[PDB]
């Protein structure tokens, strides 16, 4: 059940550095150390993300692709930056400009060939590979552009494998990039046409959660990304170990994606409280459901109330009663039946892992595919056409090699998804 992890762009690089900074403790592996885990059950599943090398040195099978050498270098000279092998370092010292076309056609394609060689080597390692996890930005050049081509080629090479993408969408309230909507519409195009699973993470969403739920007066990127790197563990690592009810990407996709349109899922975290102040330890069963199914606990700007739940995944981890979990789920599906879909008897596919997140007793990862994400699409598309009508920043793409019709096509397929989402919403 081995999987390869790929970091694309500044956003992907930064998040990847945090992910491998968290999962390292989950598996119990030091930067260049061996298995220093507390338990020994974690060792039996280290082959999912690590490649057996010098015995002591467990090398993570992650491919980091960036156009900004400085950005990638800051990771290499950081905490868990030496843990990666130089062979997996795909840096493109070319025109690192925030432009989808530039990072796809111009300076993108040239580096893609080099990336393909590395990824093909990582996939053809040992045993049987399951899929390819990717982390990128939606309003960037390397993240939205290069990453998009990476997935396009990967799905072409291994259509038998699944793809799980983690993408941070453009902040609706305060966009971090000027040409953000321009890159977003283009990146989301290849996403729906290529990847099978995708999790959306909002900028201000993390801010709000780290403000109301968590008492963090200064939620820097290192703080926000940390939370994101905790959700992915429940979707990946947590689904690698044994439990009362095991699940995986196959189990998830088949019980989450109702159509061949990918569908964007919204992530959440059950054990979300402060350090000592909120140390109530209220993590039995109903408290988790109350947290996971919270309109202000979603890592996305779109709230669950602005739509209906198409399919929900419950990835629990720790010792608990199966009957208690499922019983509580029924309660939620009954109380919130109005927006829990009426064309599917059971929309929640329960799953319970037998191992908690180290220093945590009770935990659960929330994965919900709801039509509420439709609001996000309409929001991004709105901003796109607003500037596309004027073609203000069009020349930045035209000079690279971007078709006029390409831009309109990306939006037309995106709008297509919005239209179909509503069909299942009613």
């Amino acid at each position: 059940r081995e999987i390869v992890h790929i970091q694309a762009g500044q956003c992907g690089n930064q998040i990847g550095a945090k992910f491998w900074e968290v999962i390292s403790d989950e598996h119990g592996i030091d930067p260049t150390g061996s298995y220093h885990g507390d338990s020994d059950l974690q060792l039996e599943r280290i082959n999912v993300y690590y490649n057996e090398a010098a015995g002591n040195k467990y090398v993570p099978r992650a491919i980091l692709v960036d156009l900004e050498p400085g950005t990638m270098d800051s990771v290499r000279s950081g905490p868990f930056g030496q843990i990666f092998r130089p062979d997996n370092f795909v840096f493109g010292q070319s025109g690192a400009g925030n432009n989808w076309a530039k990072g796809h056609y111009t300076e993108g394609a040239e580096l893609v060939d080099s990336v393909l060689d590395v990824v093909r080597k990582e996939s053809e390692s040992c045993d049987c590979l399951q899929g390819f996890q990717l982390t990128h930005s939606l309003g960037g050049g390397t993240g939205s552009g290069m990453g998009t081509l990476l997935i396009s080629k990967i799905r072409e090479e291994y259509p038998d494998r699944i793809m799980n993408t983690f993408s941070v969408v453009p902040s609706p309230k305060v966009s971090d990039t000027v040409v953000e909507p321009y890159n977003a519409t283009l990146s989301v195009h290849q996403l729906v046409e290529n990847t099978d699973e995708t999790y959306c993470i909002d900028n201000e969403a993390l801010y709000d959660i780290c403000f109301r739920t968590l008492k963090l007066t200064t939620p820097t990127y290192g703080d926000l990304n940390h939370l994101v790197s905790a959700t992915m563990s429940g979707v990946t690592t947590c689904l690698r170990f044994p439990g009362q009810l095991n699940a995986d990407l196959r189990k998830l996709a088949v019980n989450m994606v109702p159509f061949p349109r990918l569908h964007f899922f919204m992530p959440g975290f059950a054990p979300l409280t402060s350090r000592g102040s909120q140390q109530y330890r209220a993590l039995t069963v109903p408290e988790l459901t109350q947290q996971m199914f919270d309109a202000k606990n979603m890592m996305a700007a779109c709230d669950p109330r602005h739509g209906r739940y198409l399919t929900v995944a419950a990835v629990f981890r720790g010792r608990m009663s199966m009957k208690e979990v499922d019983e509580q789920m029924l309660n939620v599906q009954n109380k919130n039946s109005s927006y829990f879909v009426e064309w599917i008897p059971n929309n929640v596919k329960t799953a319970v892992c037998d191992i908690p997140p180290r220093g945590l007793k009770m935990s659960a990862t929330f994965i919900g595919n709801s039509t509420a994400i439709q609001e996000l699409f309409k929001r991004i598309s709105e901003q796109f056409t607003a500037m596309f009508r004027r073609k203000a920043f069009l020349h930045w793409y035209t000079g690279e090699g971007m078709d006029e019709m390409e831009f309109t096509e990306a939006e037309s397929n995106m709008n297509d998804l919005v239209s179909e989402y509503q069909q299942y919403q009613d």
Binding site: D127, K251, M322, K323, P345, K349, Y424
Partner: protein, 412 residues
Amino acid sequence: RECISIHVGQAGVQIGNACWELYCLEHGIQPDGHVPRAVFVDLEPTVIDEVRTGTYRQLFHPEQLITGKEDAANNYARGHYTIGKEIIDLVLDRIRKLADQCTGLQGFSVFHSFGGGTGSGFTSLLMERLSVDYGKKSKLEFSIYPAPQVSTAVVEPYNSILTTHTTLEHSDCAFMVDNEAIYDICRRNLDIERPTYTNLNRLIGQIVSSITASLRFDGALNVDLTEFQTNLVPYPRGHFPLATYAPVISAEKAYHEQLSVAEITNACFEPANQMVKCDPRHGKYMACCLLYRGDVVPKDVNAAIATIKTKRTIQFVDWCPTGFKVGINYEPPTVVPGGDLAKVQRAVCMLSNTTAIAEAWARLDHKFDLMYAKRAFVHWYVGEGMEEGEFSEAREDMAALEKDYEEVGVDS
């Protein structure tokens, strides 16, 4: 004489190990002792490895432990077309070696969960080869029925309906147990709010032990495996009889213990204790096998059966003048030293097929149609190598079962 068990799917392996744990417990065999005639088959590597690290690690041979290193998922299509045809040959190979090992075998004891991936697709193609290469053998499967309301998977009916579609023309008799009903028994009778999966397996295994294990032992009135189907399924269809256990008293709160034959027998006709959600709404009893194990008097059984027949409340089929199979074992009902059973000196195992099965199937049938109307996650099946014909034709085929019970039953 002997019977080979085939546990397919996660639940199949879990229940199989728990069932066999009880099997050797009463046999008086320790972890490191004979060779069990059973194999574990699952595409999920983590499930099979549980027996390789947990209890009875040195009791089973690696040859009896088929393990896939790929992904099974929860889709019938995968375990039937995609990866199913990759391990099936190896599975058949092992069960064939075991079949030849035993001199004059009776049949196979299948164990699986209707709601799953390996427990659905794998079972379907496995039984397919069994009915062709071992048509002269008794095919008795123990199918775990998904909960009517507390479903475990979203594509639950999608996998279950297809499994029973093909297996209906393969297995001679399939003993179905309701997942949710086990919880009911643990709540009302066992009186516990902590009914773990492993706790459910304790009850199901207790039934199997009395259906095969003790019944294979020289008692007072043994019932052969062939006799089972001969007196359970009056039609050449894979009908599904219920599994009821009389002693459901918990060894803690209630402590009657000394219960007469009349009471134990009467405790197998109540909806509160049937191990199935097929409540006696209007279901007529066509064939009921009563396996008594322990200190029981034949005359006491005859009297208990007679009084029930004249109860009238328990309506039998019009064309069924006498539908009671009397089974008498000399081996008492053993109980796990650390379980939740009170341990009685006599147990009654009731296994009967009623028209109530149609009601249960109708619920799942509707569940399939509901999602099928919009196809739902059909792509996760079609892309595996299944056409609409594997769904539409199955839909009609399974629908014939609702009509089957409707004709076999109800009509005078």
